[model samples]
Target: MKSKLPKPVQDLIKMIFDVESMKKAMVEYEIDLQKMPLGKLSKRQIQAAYSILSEVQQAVSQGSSDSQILDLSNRFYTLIPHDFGMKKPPLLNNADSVQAKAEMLDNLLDIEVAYSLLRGGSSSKDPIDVNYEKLKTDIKVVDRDSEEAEIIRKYVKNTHANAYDLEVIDIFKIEREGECQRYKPFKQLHNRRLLWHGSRTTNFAGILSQGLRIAPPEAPVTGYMFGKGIYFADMVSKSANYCHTSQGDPIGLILLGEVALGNMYELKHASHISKLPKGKHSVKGLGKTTPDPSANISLDGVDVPLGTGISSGVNDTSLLYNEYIVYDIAQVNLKYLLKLKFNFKTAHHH
Candidate 1:
């Protein structure tokens, strides 16, 4: 019975797994529903769309003729109709434009998974169990006084930006099916740390079903700041902004991933890396402000940069807080999932 779960927990489950929310997210992303309804979305169509994007990426990089790029762009828009009402479709000529399409395709894949599950007839099992089984993840609530919960609360409190207030509603200890085996190979990498990743509540169904993913190759090479990879942040606020939450909808989900950073190739400016140099396993965008290293603590053998925000001692950097990117998916182990409430403090101005 739905009443078996606390109201907040039930609400959390519905917010993430509801089909209507999934459709709403797609609509917000500008997918023309009449042309490509949820049922029309298939693995093959997504694959073909990615293929077109990859072609567009190559055309841009190789300096292909203007007509060639336009033709390929048209092909993509034809397959995946966007409501660009009364305007010429933007040319997907640059890396940024191509990457935007690539990301859209990425979301489409996840939406497809969620829709297929919806198509499966409902059973007597509770909605919570149905959704949990689909995720193939074990999600357990952590007692507020437990060591794990304390560590997470500290992270939310310490790394929060001065501009906003963040409160933790729930902390979940998560273990994705087969994630451990997949990450076993990279376990020995050094510089391991617990980092934060946040996304819209609507995407949680897909995110939990499929772990964090790197951008598809069909996307542009230089679309990302530090090349294509899964991105994480040491500061809670940095990642929280990606949640796209607002005052009206304050609840959001954020992931705490144990990233095996290994020997990072530190950079002060944006670098679109095609490949990391020898002995470097990941990229770290050094920031102007970072957690105090002296206050670092360990959680189950993983470093948690829970120190107060302090000057990182690096001048002329493009970032405010450190960003960690690992090209290999195996380098990350999904550990904790948190439900946070963002309390926006309206600024007072003269």
Candidate 2:
């Protein structure tokens, strides 16, 4: 009694046996299907998902005989995936250490963003609450009866992604409009790399590469670090030494990455931007410190967190061309600047 099955049939049965094993090993994540978001999906999960679905497609395309077709149909859930030379793109470029001084006023927007941020800098009130909610997106894309629409509707079914999750919407929209040959499923954009930059004036809007640009480090800039759940620091100006005529801080805290986007990628940091105690409000305006100077950072001279994605240096390095600003600390500090090593002093021009 030698065992023999229809060669194709036998191969198909083996495939079914294989996927059942995967079914046991593979598991779902704590996810909300309808509120569609695959950003949380792991590198393996993302590709595996595509991998299996691709197998199903190949089975359909290759099957011609009645048995092959029906067999695939009956065991739709148990087919092995085909290899399509797949690879997930890396997400970040410069992951750690804010050490590399920004290429003196160059276009760095193409730099992949590290965090999703928000700051509606209003004057009447204190800067916007470091709205850590910038990463949440909840919206209903107009559902339609099509693969493009249905799949989106299915996954995004009840799900509403946040502004961050929807970041790639614009790119796809362009593809959809342009009829680009490279258009892919929306899920493919997850963890993908992309670039963003400043208005040369308007603030970060919602990016981490442009971390914090120097918008007068003497002014309050509210932002959230898109790392480890949600870390944030509402940077309020405690003091500053502004020029009566020209306003600018000598060196700003360059830019500190807020999110741990990946390995070889995270953030590099600095000298003095004190993290305030929980439930404590950051001091704003000149000389308003409660305990002399704990978060007391000196922007009069030192690389400060960037603002507006305009430049990394405190005083805009391109100020001469951009405006009547000073990239060089050519002013007399009233006090010996060298004394700053031991003590600190700063004030804003009223």
Candidate 3:
């Protein structure tokens, strides 16, 4: 059956297998770690353990298929401890060891099922195309005005001030702790029902600019947000009218960022932004630039031309630094009334 899949799809399947194997190795490693004297571990051993765990986390978070996840899990398991010498003694006692092993196996099986579903492997008879459509619809924008609009407003405001510096330090600071309060009213209106009903949810994030800053002083800026939606990256370019610069260019751009859904109440994960080297995702370059062709990057598999629009980079930076507002919300459920607490932080430019 795997032979029928295209190479890319097949690669995805292989990844799942590897992840599974890694998971097994990890379990075995854990047992070994438990048995080993904590103080006796060498620096190399510690580093190896940490590296395996990091790889597992990365693969689980980024892999798009069960095969990919399984492959990662397998790699993790292989790198970690498979056995502890008999002289060292088993990590668990007779009863506890049996129970622990059983529990670990159970968890592994459960995650396998989850990975399978994530990789689009299920009992449904629909073709892969049909399944993709169904999955997309399931994660559709029931209320674009609420979700998309609110997120866009917040993102614009949060990163507004950093447009001037375009430095990694400036961007990192904003991301770590920037003000996002201006969207309070909109967030309230949009999230009220969701908070009350406690329905499953999802989110997305991205950048919105016109062009890259090629020359230093007063360069034009055009960017967009790239995130999950019906069309992912393409939607940002298609909806480019939303971006603007203080210098009066209708740079209108929205580069989708991290997207979160389900019971995860935190920020949605974005591969482009979150996984950038040294946590630096934003890059300054020439206008009408596209992502590097050789880079192992996926623009959410959506096709969109990369180009700079008609907005001065300096003007856009000023707009973001001076006029943007930041806002965030946390929802809690009560039997009588759904409660939502929101806050915003503002940016100060020197």
Candidate 4:
């Protein structure tokens, strides 16, 4: 089965299936892996964790007694055991603590997807085929010499950050099952553009199975900058940071979403508004530098802002790169999936 794929495709499969990446994400959040192994992760357990966090959130809001807050915090730790190294488990009394746990639950949902894939895999079937089945997305490799490939490559090379180097290893065009139908209504929306969305390798399974989502109601509010919504970026590096790829395993997967940013409600500072103003479709966080608007190109009728960085004339902004947030999930159509290599530039001159 492994021999059936080209070298690059085979490598991509191995990278996505790497269990160590899943474990590493968990350990970073201080989860006691021995107590709650990847196999132990389930939908019910994650739901229970979220519920406990919600309890803490309510307690904090009501200014409940210290004993009650401490009790709820302990219950959260009990359900999702953490490794505090003999130190007292911090009480989840503030926005930061609750926000941290909310993020952990988010990762846990993705981790559960990866674990389910492993348990559902068969020795007889080609792993790639099985993986594709689990993802419910049909994936095809794009020829490197093709025009589309050239456009994507140019995007990567042009929009990368100055401090880190990004190289595209492979580009796979994905058609998530039913995504086209789901996105059809917003297809004709004005200001539709192709944008970047990056996530950890461990989250790809969940992301593909169920499209990118806003935070749940129980999740803490502090986790989001411009409110609860699916976020996209014009600069490749801006979204790439969300991938959280480390030097040890520099490979990461990113998506190019055709976002329906119809009528952008532009802002220089974080407003944290859950609902947009009248007649607005999305929110755009202005940045100092943005892709030159004049150089924007069209790909199959959808606009691609692949132009090199230029001053956006937006001073006194909280963000360095432009961020696009669309509250409606139907507004995004997953277009292309890319595997990228992150090369960190050393302090010494090259």
Give the per-residue lDDT digits (tens) of candidate 2, residues 224-268: 121112121212111111100112312211111111111112122
* Winner of 2 and 4 under TM-score: 4
Supply candidate 4's per-residue lDDT for 105.
92
Question: Which stretches in model 2 have alpha-carbon errors above 4 Å?
Answer: 1-143, 158-172, 175-222, 225-350
What clash count goes with each model?
0, 30, 76, 0
Candidate 4 Cα outliers beyond 4 Å, as residue runs: 1-3, 121-123, 347-350
Q: State, as a TM-score between 0 and 1, how close model 4 is to the true structure.
A: 0.92
- Of candidates 2 and 1, the better by TM-score: 1
For model 1, the stretches where C-alpha displacement exceeds 4 angstroms are 1-9, 120-122, 348-350
Q: What is the lDDT of residue 253 in candidate 4?
A: 94
- TM-score sort, best first: 4, 1, 3, 2
lDDT of 1 by residue, 24-48 (tens): 7778878788887888888778878
lDDT of 4 by residue, 198-267 (tens): 9888888788778898877656555577888999999998989978877687888999999999899999
Model 1 has an lDDT value of 0.83
lDDT of 3 by residue, 234-294 (tens): 1222222222222322111122322111121212221212122342222222222222223
**Winner by lDDT between candidate 3 and candidate 1:** 1
